[PDB]
Amino acid sequence: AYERQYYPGATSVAANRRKHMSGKLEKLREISDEDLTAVLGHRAPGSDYPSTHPPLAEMGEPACSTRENVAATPGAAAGDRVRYIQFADSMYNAPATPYFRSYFAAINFRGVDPGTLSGRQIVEARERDMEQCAKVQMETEITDHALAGVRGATVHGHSVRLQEDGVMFDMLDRRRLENGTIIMDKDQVAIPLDRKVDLGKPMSSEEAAKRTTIYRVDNVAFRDDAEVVEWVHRIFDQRTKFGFQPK
Amino acid sequence: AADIFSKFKKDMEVKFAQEFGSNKQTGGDITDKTAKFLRLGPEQDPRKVEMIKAGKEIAEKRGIAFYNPMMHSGAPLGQRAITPYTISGTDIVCEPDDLHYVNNAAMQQMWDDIRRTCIVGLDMAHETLEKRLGKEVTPETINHYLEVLNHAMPGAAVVQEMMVETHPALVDDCYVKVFTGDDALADEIDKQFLIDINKEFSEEQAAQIKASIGKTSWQAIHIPTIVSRTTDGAQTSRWAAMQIGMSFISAYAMCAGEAAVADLSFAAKHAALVSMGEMLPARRARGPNEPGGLSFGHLSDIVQTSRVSEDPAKIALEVVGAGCMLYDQIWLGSYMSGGVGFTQYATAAYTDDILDNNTYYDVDYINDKYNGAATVGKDNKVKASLEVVKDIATESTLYGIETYEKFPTALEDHFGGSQRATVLAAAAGVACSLATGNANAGLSGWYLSMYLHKEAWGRLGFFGFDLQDQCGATNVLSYQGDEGLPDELRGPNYPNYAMNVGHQGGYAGIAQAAHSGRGDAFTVNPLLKVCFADDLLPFNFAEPRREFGRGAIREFVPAGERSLVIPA
Amino acid sequence: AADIFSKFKKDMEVKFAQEFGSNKQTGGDITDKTAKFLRLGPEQDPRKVEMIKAGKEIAEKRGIAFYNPMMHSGAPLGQRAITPYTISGTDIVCEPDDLHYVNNAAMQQMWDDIRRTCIVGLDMAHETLEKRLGKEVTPETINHYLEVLNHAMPGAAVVQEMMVETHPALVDDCYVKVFTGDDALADEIDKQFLIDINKEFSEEQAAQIKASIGKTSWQAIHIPTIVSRTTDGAQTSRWAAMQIGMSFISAYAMCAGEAAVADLSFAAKHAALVSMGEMLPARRARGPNEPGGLSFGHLSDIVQTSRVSEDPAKIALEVVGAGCMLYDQIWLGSYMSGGVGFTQYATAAYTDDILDNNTYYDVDYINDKYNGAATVGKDNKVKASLEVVKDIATESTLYGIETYEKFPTALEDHFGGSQRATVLAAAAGVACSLATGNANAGLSGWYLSMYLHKEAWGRLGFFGFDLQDQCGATNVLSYQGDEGLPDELRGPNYPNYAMNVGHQGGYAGIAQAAHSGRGDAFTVNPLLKVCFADDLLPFNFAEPRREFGRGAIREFVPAGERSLVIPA
Amino acid sequence: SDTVDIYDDRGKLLESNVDIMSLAPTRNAAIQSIIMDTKRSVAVNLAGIQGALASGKMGGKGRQILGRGLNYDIVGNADAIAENVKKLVQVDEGDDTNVIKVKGGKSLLIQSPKSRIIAGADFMSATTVGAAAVTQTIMDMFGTDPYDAPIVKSAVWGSYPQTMDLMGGQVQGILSIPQNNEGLGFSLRNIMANHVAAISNRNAMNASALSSIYEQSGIFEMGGAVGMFERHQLLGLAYQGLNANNLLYDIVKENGKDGTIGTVIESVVRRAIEAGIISVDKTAPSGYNFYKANDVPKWNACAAVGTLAATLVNCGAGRAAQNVSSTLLYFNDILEKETGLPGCDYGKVEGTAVGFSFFSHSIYGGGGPGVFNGNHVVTRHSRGFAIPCVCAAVALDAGTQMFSIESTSGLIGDVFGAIPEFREPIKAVAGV
Amino acid sequence: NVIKVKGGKSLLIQSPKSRIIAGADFMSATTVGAAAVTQTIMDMFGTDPYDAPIVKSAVWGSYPQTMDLMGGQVQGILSIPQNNEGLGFSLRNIMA
Numbered sequence A: 001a002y003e004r005q006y007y008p009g010a011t012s013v014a015a016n017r018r019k020h021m022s023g024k025l026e027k028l029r030e031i032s033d034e035d036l037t038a039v040l041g042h043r044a045p046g047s048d049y050p051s052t053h054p055p056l057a058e059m060g061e062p063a064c065s066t067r068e069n070v071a072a073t074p075g076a077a078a079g080d081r082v083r084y085i086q087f088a089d090s091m092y093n094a095p096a097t098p099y100f101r102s103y104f105a106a107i108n109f110r111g112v113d114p115g116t117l118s119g120r121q122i123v124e125a126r127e128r129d130m131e132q133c134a135k136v137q138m139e140t141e142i143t144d145h146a147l148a149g150v151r152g153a154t155v156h157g158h159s160v161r162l163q164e165d166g167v168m169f170d171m172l173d174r175r176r177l178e179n180g181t182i183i184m185d186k187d188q189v190a191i192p193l194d195r196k197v198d199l200g201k202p203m204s205s206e207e208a209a210k211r212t213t214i215y216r217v218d219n220v221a222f223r224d225d226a227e228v229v230e231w232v233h234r235i236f237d238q239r240t241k242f243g244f245q246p247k
Numbered sequence B, C: 001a002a003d004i005f006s007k008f009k010k011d012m013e014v015k016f017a018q019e020f021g022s023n024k025q026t027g028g029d030i031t032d033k034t035a036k037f038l039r040l041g042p043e044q045d046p047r048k049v050e051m052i053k054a055g056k057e058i059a060e061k062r063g064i065a066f067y068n069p070m071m072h073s074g075a076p077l078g079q080r081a082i083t084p085y086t087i088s089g090t091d092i093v094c095e096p097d098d099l100h101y102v103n104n105a106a107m108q109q110m111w112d113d114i115r116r117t118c119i120v121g122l123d124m125a126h127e128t129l130e131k132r133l134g135k136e137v138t139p140e141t142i143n144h145y146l147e148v149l150n151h152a153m154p155g156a157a158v159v160q161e162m163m164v165e166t167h168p169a170l171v172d173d174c175y176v177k178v179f180t181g182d183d184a185l186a187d188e189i190d191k192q193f194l195i196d197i198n199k200e201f202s203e204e205q206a207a208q209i210k211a212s213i214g215k216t217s218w219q220a221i222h223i224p225t226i227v228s229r230t231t232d233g234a235q236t237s238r239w240a241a242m243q244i245g246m247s248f249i250s251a252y253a254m255c256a257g258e259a260a261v262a263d264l265s266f267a268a269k270h271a272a273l274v275s276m277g278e279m280l281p282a283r284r285a286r287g288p289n290e291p292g293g294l295s296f297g298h299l300s301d302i303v304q305t306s307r308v309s310e311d312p313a314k315i316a317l318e319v320v321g322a323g324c325m326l327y328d329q330i331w332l333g334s335y336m337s338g339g340v341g342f343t344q345y346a347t348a349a350y351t352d353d354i355l356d357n358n359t360y361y362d363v364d365y366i367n368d369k370y371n372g373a374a375t376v377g378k379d380n381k382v383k384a385s386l387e388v389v390k391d392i393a394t395e396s397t398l399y400g401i402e403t404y405e406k407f408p409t410a411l412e413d414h415f416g417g418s419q420r421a422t423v424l425a426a427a428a429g430v431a432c433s434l435a436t437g438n439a440n441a442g443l444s445g446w447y448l449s450m451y452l453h454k455e456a457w458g459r460l461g462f463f464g465f466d467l468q469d470q471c472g473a474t475n476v477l478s479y480q481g482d483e484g485l486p487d488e489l490r491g492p493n494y495p496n497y498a499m500n501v502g503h504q505g506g507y508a509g510i511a512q513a514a515h516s517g518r519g520d521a522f523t524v525n526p527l528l529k530v531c532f533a534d535d536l537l538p539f540n541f542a543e544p545r546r547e548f549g550r551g552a553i554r555e556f557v558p559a560g561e562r563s564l565v566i567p568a
Numbered sequence D: 001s002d003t004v005d006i007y008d009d010r011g012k013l014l015e016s017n018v019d020i021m022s023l024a025p026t027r028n029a030a031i032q033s034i035i036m037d038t039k040r041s042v043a044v045n046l047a048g049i050q051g052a053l054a055s056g057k058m059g060g061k062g063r064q065i066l067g068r069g070l071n072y073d074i075v076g077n078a079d080a081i082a083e084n085v086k087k088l089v090q091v092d093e094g095d096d097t098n099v100i101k102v103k104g105g106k107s108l109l110i111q112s113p114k115s116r117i118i119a120g121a122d123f124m125s126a127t128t129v130g131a132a133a134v135t136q137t138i139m140d141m142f143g144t145d146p147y148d149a150p151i152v153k154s155a156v157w158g159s160y161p162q163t164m165d166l167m168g169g170q171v172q173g174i175l176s177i178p179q180n181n182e183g184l185g186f187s188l189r190n191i192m193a194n195h196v197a198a199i200s201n202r203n204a205m206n207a208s209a210l211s212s213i214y215e216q217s218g219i220f221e222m223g224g225a226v227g228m229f230e231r232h233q234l235l236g237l238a239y240q241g242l243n244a245n246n247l248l249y250d251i252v253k254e255n256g257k258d259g260t261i262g263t264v265i266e267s268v269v270r271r272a273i274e275a276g277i278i279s280v281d282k283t284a285p286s287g288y289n290f291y292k293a294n295d296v297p298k299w300n301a302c303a304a305v306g307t308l309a310a311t312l313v314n315c316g317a318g319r320a321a322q323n324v325s326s327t328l329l330y331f332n333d334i335l336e337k338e339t340g341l342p343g344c345d346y347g348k349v350e351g352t353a354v355g356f357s358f359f360s361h362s363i364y365g366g367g368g369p370g371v372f373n374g375n376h377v378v379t380r381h382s383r384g385f386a387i388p389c390v391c392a393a394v395a396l397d398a399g400t401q402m403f404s405i406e407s408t409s410g411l412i413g414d415v416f417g418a419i420p421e422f423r424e425p426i427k428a429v430a431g432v
Numbered sequence E: 001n002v003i004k005v006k007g008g009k010s011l012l013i014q015s016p017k018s019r020i021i022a023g024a025d026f027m028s029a030t031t032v033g034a035a036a037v038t039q040t041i042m043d044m045f046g047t048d049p050y051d052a053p054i055v056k057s058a059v060w061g062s063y064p065q066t067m068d069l070m071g072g073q074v075q076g077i078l079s080i081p082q083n084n085e086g087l088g089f090s091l092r093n094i095m096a
């Protein structure tokens, strides 16, 4: 029986990376089912999930061992559309970094299609399955809602200087600090919501620095986590050697 | 190095801490992590205002919708500050839009000057005249041939009666010069036709070129830009061959169309032709002399900085700039896609002295740790190894990352992860090439940078940025058929490289760096190095980055315009 | 027919019997077999004088030899008379040099207008939004999408912050319109975006088009000429697809980059794309939308004369003119060779009403012998046979030959046998197509004309003129893999046709003639026919020959010039 | 001497103690039979020809030649046409020529005798002779006038030879045309993923099996399996492609109910340690164990199996093809971070997956997983270890794609899916 | 069959028929031949991994930047398949 170790390193950043990868994330706030559906913007809150094809139980499936041995998710079974949740995360110590959101999704959720980019990270999945993953990302420490933002388009901000109130720039102003709490009053493609969503009080810069999976020279320097630099060196060496001759 | 670091900081001050147009960025500390975003929209930028006005008027005039910033989702461009770019190594401050290739005649002309150029040997042609016709080829007959050729090449007649011809005013950029590794012949060539290798290159570099090509003679042909623009790259070698054939017929009193002429044709079109680049496979089908066929070594040799500078980093950096512009803005950003395209994917590597800062830091690090290995020399280089690559590339990348982190202005500047990846990896790769004299050690450094970058920030580039970078380290020293290749011979059609921005210009700089560190005359082809050692070409290939700046400020005069035949 | 014969004779008078410039051709009978040759040289022609002066000054300025008529073997051009050309069907008298494509903005723009154009279906993209996202597509969402698209397509941003964009003043010729065989949808499209099939075509032709394409909707995309000139033809479909993708993302509030977007990409780039032409094999390697891939039916449909004329001969003759210009002057005369090129190989088919004379004689002959078979109709045609081809093509060729013999001016005009062969065979082929409604009966007539021509004069064309013509008759009705093909689907890459001047424009006219004689809306592709039924394009595809004349008199305004960013 | 036991798609033992060298495309009779049949066979759409003849719609998108209509009952004469086509396609009486009527006469399977492939440089004779046979047959059967011959010809051949292919024609094979090859030895890699899934009848593991056979036959023709690289590629073919030792099946099964990309990594690393293929090289201060591969080609094969197993689990759970691009990326990326060992193909599966993800989620090109193939610029880079997963992913899709199997590969699946060795490739290679 | 010709200045490399039987076309003769020579030189002369690209391109030339082995040292009687103008043309691409 193999116990996964996930990631090297012995700093707070490496420890936080293992927390994200293993899905051991502290719940910090609550979002209702309807508010989650509202911010995602794929259907009216509380409405039935639209479908892209009939339920598996209705149309039937080919009989092969994989379909028999691999259980379809509730979203696949229902024939849901594949929809998404996408985040931008500030490089100024947002808890999340793009690759580690994707690892979080790949390791802890079934039937997911994560994508990593510098300014955006996305999980595509059958809509109801996606909402399960979305809820954890919205509620737990993997997201600070000042330093991050749910953005399905026009994502610019991850590398831009922070606003003086500690909130990451949004071209389309979907969420901001109001009375010491983060309010989101548009969905992730910036269509105004009927009801604004309280995404809770932001982390202090101090707490963000402790919870972040990003290295920075003025918090926890990458150079100082020798194990992770060595890991890179070992992967590099081995890839180079085995490309010449796999021995 | 200190001077470049000061230049980088000045760039950040100009870009972020003093107003550009009406963006109201009237002050600030370039190390500050925070900023105020004014939500001014596109009107903060005078070029954008000009574009909006033109878009409105043209839409009204032509009767169908056109440029309109309000069609942008959510809000128009410029909700944060629209800020300028300074061309690296210069004080030329540019409107961002003026660096889009469509808006920049210098950028378009650099490509036209490459596209409309090929090199054709003379020796085979002369052997043909000697063997088949019994003709005696002398300096006199060659000089007469060259004057006939420089009449014929732009599109003028030498044999038939009742010919129409191209208007000289439309094709004034078309000409043919010659060069030769035979010093005795070079002394006899009418100087108006000669690219003098002994004059244009240092004694060491001239020796390398002449030893490489031997006592052989070559034509540097540049066909009309207006023709290149009407047609394509594959036009070039055909155009050159037609008028070479006509000029041999006329100058040597051959039958105007005999069997021996066909040998001159095959010599000019195939046997003694050197193209800028070769054809591309079906999915990206293109004939010769298109950007995808242009090997990284060939671009390094078209760029003339190696001839006029003794600074190996400067030489590499000019090639990076030229390559990022051509390969990303015109090739990948237009030929292979289009639209708004990839201006700033490229500008990150030739503006605001950020790449230069990382690179010159590396040079000092290498010189300090490796007994001046980054200074010009062939016998002061470090043996390429995994150890040396890991040392230099890791140090390079850590410094570059720390600079982005200590200067939030630099991070906002290169806002895309791909831009930062290109800069960090280019510096690391160029550094490894400089220290080792091994271009593929440079490639290894490039890929190691990407790997360190990814783990440092938990992000790298865009969705498909590191297809080649994850295939990268393992394919550097592979000798498998479609994997192995020296970087000098690699290019945009090397399978891993065939798609994605942010790389090809860097690889060209890495190829160049391996040879500039050695003081080599060329990176892979002396024929191209000499061909473009010529100030008559409209684009100054010795200063490609600065040329882009001259284009931005509308002081670059291109060839190929049609105002002569256009109404008032 | 009488009126065209009078135009022909008038053209001979203008060309030969009244002096042009200072050529001193002040009199003479156009049937005279003799002339005096004054040995005046190039100075007899005012354009040549202008060119000489320009070449002299530019050579002096740039410091290397240039245009100089004295470099011509033996003597400079014009030891006989340099005489003008009149564009057929017009009174536009041209300087011969002004009809070289390099010197003619109308010719260059015609190619650019074809090169920068592609057609992309909307239905599959709409089905993608429906199925994957559950989107409802309405005329409202389509009209919004189209306005977003016409902002985005020229090179402007709709999603990202901090984008640079193409200057609207440089790309004002770029736009996207739509057309649809769904009348109900057509009624709801904002008219600024619509190519109205019912408005632009007669009711019969509109019915044929709508029956052909069904209730399907299409985008007619024309990307910027400045981009087309910087890049190539294979650029066009990529450019179109990029901005179609961005506009669907923006207009329908998709994720800016999700799996469904890739389906839109494949649809735009492959599954719902109609190119002007397909890629070419390795020896003449080129991607899509180059002249070699442009089938004869496709050119016939790009040319818009069929829509605005009821004269089947006129419609075929305009396609011949457009084809001879494009295929011989730009394609074979530049892309595939270059230099002075093939201006007069092409002008022979669209100047001095010689081809028109032979063709209209044929129309009268056919109508008188075959109960008006050359008048517009589908049920009045003669069954294609060796009998009918032999009758029409023999009569056509004998008349044309005898006209060259009765008017020595006509013979001296078309001084090359290839020119005469193109004219005689085009007339005979168009005639056979008009009479039968069978384009390959037209091809048979073309080849028979060549065979009769050869035996009549003991000569035909240039050295390799009749490679395809000796392969011709036998390959017309072959059904072997690389031999058989309807003329409508043939093009410059049909193996026999791949090399030689004086044919491809004729074959295009022959393809058109089979369908113009029937009154057909199109020759092979309704999508191209409707795409170019649009007066916003700078080139008037309804009258290509006259447009070449507008270009010769410097009254054609091209797109894609860079004046805005060039210094004064 | 590396041997494996071959298990089928349902995890049942087929053959024990099979030398992996016997599985080489260059030695294996079943694989060579699949290659020969792929080379020598084409599908002809008879209903398409009939429609093209009647309407003039031939030669490409939008094309129609007006006024040249021929009303031939092609489909109603399908049996007589098949018979005459066989007479023309065959080289000797009673040879291995096979012409079969498909879908009630709407299409034909035309299998040239192997003699045409033996006497040919490549595989295009199947297309050219097939098209010629059909063209001649229609010309004779319906008494076409010579001046209508061009119409009958192009109904079958489309725009060839103006185009390089039979664009807008009615003849298709599993392969493309040789000129579409990006590299040398790439012909058998230019097979659309939707084709393979169609032929497999949407059986995921048989799809990845057949794809593996094609891909490795390509790598072998590329000269990418010479010397030490032969064992390297054959371990991959055996384990990832042919379910060697039931490893693929067992890993999928134990992760099938609740498994993710992440749990498949646990299965792969646990089994690799159990087999002695990898062991701890060094333990860092944090407790992190850096591993070393004791058999590098075998470790690569473990990673190859894991990549496919993760695809079957993650695409299987979603019944969605698109999950394959991220699966290939993150299985290998996360595997490297778990172990300190390089992922499959030493980064090249991960790399392929990065661009493959991008070009299946962006504006720039590509498309859904089904359009990709080993000759595609996006997905060529890995040495055969990525595309088999793509074929399996496409097979598992329940209906999320615009460019589905039916859309692109309906004719191919109908014409070729009935060939036993093609539909059951693991059983074919095992010798049943 | 591998034969030394011209006193060792060149080799004839004939692949076994099995490589042609298992192949779609004929390029396996070139790629396997070149791969065999490349591997043999790498081993025989103890080439350091960072010099492997130089040994490889001495044999393969500019492949895979070019579609052919341009500037390499391997030739056959045929060309490469992508140079075919038509379908079935490979055996026709042999210069006189």
Ligand code: F43
Binding pocket: A117, A118, A119, A120, A152, A153, A154, A155, A156, A157, A158, A159, B338, B339, B340, B341, B342, B343, B344, B345, B346, B415, B416, B417, B418, B419, B461, B462, B463, C156, C157, C158, C159, C160, C161, C163, C164, C242, C243, C246, C249, C256, C257, D361, D362, D363, D364
């Ligand atoms: C719509 C897509 C999906 C796709 O396939 N391509 C896009 C868009 C496309 C469009 C954007 C133009 C427009 O706004 O209409 C163009 C210009 C290509 C074109 N069609 O001309 C482009 N990308 Ni993109 N794109 C870019 C970038 C990026 C970076 C931006 C990150 C940030 O924080 O701002 C991210 C990827 C990443 O996170 O790494 C990115 C994504 C995307 N890129 C996401 C949209 C993301 C968003 O919603 O904002 N681009 C860059 O990082 C720099 C270069 C820059 C390109 C323009 C230029 O080079 O000047 C542009 C290049």
Ligand SMILES: C[C@@H](OP(=O)(O)O)[C@H](NC(=O)CCCCCCS)C(=O)O
Binding pocket: B283, B284, B332, B333, B336, B337, B498, B499, B500, B501, C238, C269, C270, D359, D364, D365, D366, D367, D377, D378
């Ligand atoms: C993949 C391929 O596209 P297709 O899948 O064939 O449609 C290819 N495009 C590109 O590689 C475009 C690259 C430049 C734009 C993205 C840069 S990161 C091409 O058009 O030939």
Ligand SMILES: O=S(=O)(O)CCS
Binding pocket: A117, B462, B463, B464, C257, D358, D361, D362
């Ligand atoms: O967002 S994507 O990485 O697909 C495109 C970057 S320009």
Ligand SMILES: O=S(=O)(O)CCS
Binding pocket: B257, C462, C463, C464
């Ligand atoms: O004289 S040749 O027929 O070879 C060339 C005609 S332009």
